[PDB]
């Protein structure tokens, strides 16, 4: 949305690595 | 940030530090939206009741930082501002309604493992994620306690709270351009933004396309991490059209 | 607050 390569982090999404608490977020969306 | 944790390197690549040239001091947080545009809270620049009114030459933007005070030698990039745009209907006289501003950089910043733009929400991303109970993430170098400073970027994950609950926790008149977030006295989990975090981003990770979306701007609160009190944030999607307008009409 | 290079 606000960019193109927007919101995909070089050190996490782009390498398919997850940060330490992002699952907490994802588990809250039901 | 109160009751948060140290961020991991490269965790919030769109996090920007608003820095005053003299005295050299941390003014507020902000976020990178493209290679030339930064989004922050209007009250970081203009707050007349406190004789606050910064101009483009008063500040610097610092991108790709982790350490609060250190000059991050070949990691961070420092930019000068070309122009500041405050929402025309920013209400500093009463409730900080429409607390938003755009800053255009003199020159585009180059992306790296530590510098990358966040996405702006579309009506549909807004509609499925801005729901009470859903958690967002707030980041900043602000105060650790109401009444000290972190040495590194701090992060906290907070649930969006139902509007009525937001309304009933304060005497300030709440508008459609705001949302509140935090834990309820009973959830027995806590955390909040605090002085120094203003203008930083409230983000959510789309379960649809796994991209990070900026849903709010740290705006205001009463004290920090007070039981039965909640942090309030500018509603980015509701002001998106003004965002598009200035970019289109003025830059990029 | 560590100093920023003067070019800035
Ligand atoms: N999440 C929190 N508990 N607080 C975040 C506070 C962030 C902080 C900047 O970093 N923002 C401000 O100080 C914005 N601001 C401006 C003046 C004082 C005000 N706090 S206050 O308790 O007076 C309530 C108030 C009064 C007028 C308009 C909005 C809210 C207020 O919150
Ligand atoms: C804010 O500063 C600019 C010039 O520096 C001007 O628009 C205005 O009069 C100043 N004061 C207020 C209240 O905005």
Q: In whole angstroms, what is the distance from residue B233 CA to residue B83 CA?
A: 24
B82 Cα: distance to centroid of ligand 1 (angstroms): 27
Task: Please answer whether residues B17 and B70 qualify as being in contact, where contact means their C-beta atoms are separated by less than 8 angstroms.
Answer: no
- CB burial string B226-241: b at 16+ within 10 A, e below: beebbbbbbbbbbbbe
Q: In whole angstroms, what is the distance from residue B136 CA to residue A24 CA?
A: 10
Which residue range forms the structural domain that includes residue A6? 1-30
Beta bridge partners, B52, equal B47
> What is the interface size between B and C, counted as CB pairs within 8 Å?
19
Q: Provide the shortest C-alpha distance from residue B103 to chain C (in Å).
A: 17
- Same CATH topology for B1-12+118-237 and B13-117+238-251: the answer is yes
Topology adopted by domain B13-117+238-251: Thrombin, subunit H (2.40.10)
Q: In whole angstroms, what is the distance from residue B247 CA to residue B235 CA?
A: 18
Q: Which residues contact B171 (CB under 8 A, 6 or more apart)?
A: none
C8 contacts in B (CB within 8 Å)? Answer: 60, 78, 80
Method of elucidation: X-ray
The conformation of residue A25, written as its DSSP 8-state character, comes to: H
- The 3 state secondary structure assigned to chain B is CECCEECCCCCCCCEEEEEEECCEEEEEEEEECCCCEEEECHHHCEEHHHCEECCCCCEEEEECCCECCCCCCCCCEEEEEEEEEECCCCECCCCCECCCEEEEECCCCCCCCCCCCCECCCHHHHHHHCCCCCEEEEEECCCCCCCCCCCECEEEEEEECCHHHHHHCCCCCCCCCEEEECCCCCCCCCCECCCCCCCCEEEEECCCCCCEEEEEEEEECCCCCCCCCCEEEEEHHHHHHHHHHHHHHHCC
Q: In whole angstroms, what is the distance from residue B21 CA to residue B11 CA?
A: 27
B248 class by beta-carbon count within 10 Å (0-12 exposed, 13-18 middle, 19+ buried):
exposed
Task: Please answer whether residues B33 and B39 qualify as being in contact, where contact means their C-beta atoms are separated by less than 8 angstroms.
Answer: yes
CATH architecture, range B1-12+118-237: Beta Barrel (2.40)
The conformation of residue A20, written as its DSSP 8-state character, comes to: T
Q: In whole angstroms, what is the distance from residue A12 CA to residue B111 CA?
A: 15
Find the residues whose C-beta lies inside 6 A of ligand 1.
B 28, 43, 95-96, 142, 172, 192-198, 218, 220-222, 224, 231
How many domains does the structure of chain A reveal?
A: 1
Beta bridge partners, B17, equal B29, B62
Q: In whole angstroms, what is the distance from residue B2 CA to residue B127 CA?
A: 28
Q: Is A13 helix (H, G, I), strand (E, B) or coil?
A: helix
Please state the atom number of ligand 2 nearest to the C-alpha of residue B48.
13
Q: Which of B138, B192, B221, B231 to mutate to test the pocket of ligand 1 (most atoms within 8 A of CB)?
A: B221
Task: Please answer whether residues B27 and B18 qualify as being in contact, where contact means their C-beta atoms are separated by less than 8 angstroms.
Answer: yes
Q: What is the CATH number of the domain that holds A28?
A: 4.10.140.10
Dihedral over Cα of B141, B143, B148, B154: its sign: negative
Ligand approaching nearest to the C-alpha of B194: 1
Q: In whole angstroms, what is the distance from residue B60 CA to residue B63 CA?
A: 10
Going by alpha carbons, the residue nearest to atom 3 of ligand 2 is B53
Q: Is A23 helix (H, G, I), strand (E, B) or coil?
A: helix
DSSP percent split of chain A into helix, strand, coil, nearest 5 = 25, 0, 75
Q: In whole angstroms, what is the distance from residue B171 CA to residue B252 CA?
A: 41
Q: Is A14 helix (H, G, I), strand (E, B) or coil?
A: helix
Cα pseudo-dihedral B26, A13, B8, B240, rounded to 10: 20
List chain B domain ranges.
1-12+118-237, 13-117+238-251
Cβ-defined contact of B117 to A7 (cutoff 8 Å)? yes
Q: In whole angstroms, what is the distance from residue B125 CA to residue B206 CA?
A: 8
Chain B residues with CB within 8 Å of chain C CB: 19, 24-26, 60, 69-71, 78, 80
- CA B172-B157-B228 angle, 5° bins: 35
The conformation of residue C1, written as its DSSP 8-state character, comes to: -
B214 contacts in A (CB within 8 Å)? Answer: 2
């Amino acid at each position: 949305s606000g960019e193109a390569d927007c919101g995909l982090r070089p050190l996490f999404e782009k390498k398919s690595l997850e940060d330490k608490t992002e699952r907490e977020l994802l588990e809250s969306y039901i | 940030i109160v009751e948060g944790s140290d961020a991991e390197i490269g965790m919030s690549p769109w996090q920007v530090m608003l820095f005053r040239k003299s005295p050299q001091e941390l003014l507020c947080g902000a976020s990178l939206i493209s290679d030339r545009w930064v989004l922050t809270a209007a009250h970081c620049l203009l707050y007349p009741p406190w004789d606050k009114n910064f101009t483009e030459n008063d500040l610097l933007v610092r991108i790709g930082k982790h350490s609060r005070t250190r000059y991050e030698r070949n990691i961070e990039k420092i930019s000068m501002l070309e122009k500041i745009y405050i929402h025309p209907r920013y209400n500093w006289r009463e409730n900080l309604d429409r607390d938003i501003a755009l800053m255009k950089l003199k020159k585009p910043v180059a992306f790296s493992d530590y510098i990358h733009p966040v996405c702006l929400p579309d009506r549909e991303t807004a509609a499925s994620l801005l729901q009470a109970g859903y958690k967002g993430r707030v980041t900043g170098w602000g105060n650790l306690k109401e009444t000290g400073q972190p040495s590194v970027l701090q992060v906290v994950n907070l649930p969006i709270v139902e509007r009525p609950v937001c309304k009933d926790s304060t005497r300030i008149r709440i508008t459609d351009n705001m949302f509140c977030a935090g834990y309820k006295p009973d959830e027995g989990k806590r955390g909040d933004a605090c002085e120094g975090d203003s203008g930083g981003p409230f983000v959510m990770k789309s379960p649809f396309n796994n991209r990070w979306y900026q849903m709010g701007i740290v705006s205001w609160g009463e004290g920090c991490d007070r039981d039965g009190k909640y942090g309030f944030y500018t509603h980015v999607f509701r002001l998106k059209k003004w965002i598009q307008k200035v970019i289109d009409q003025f830059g990029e | 607050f560590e100093e920023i290079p003067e070019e800035y």
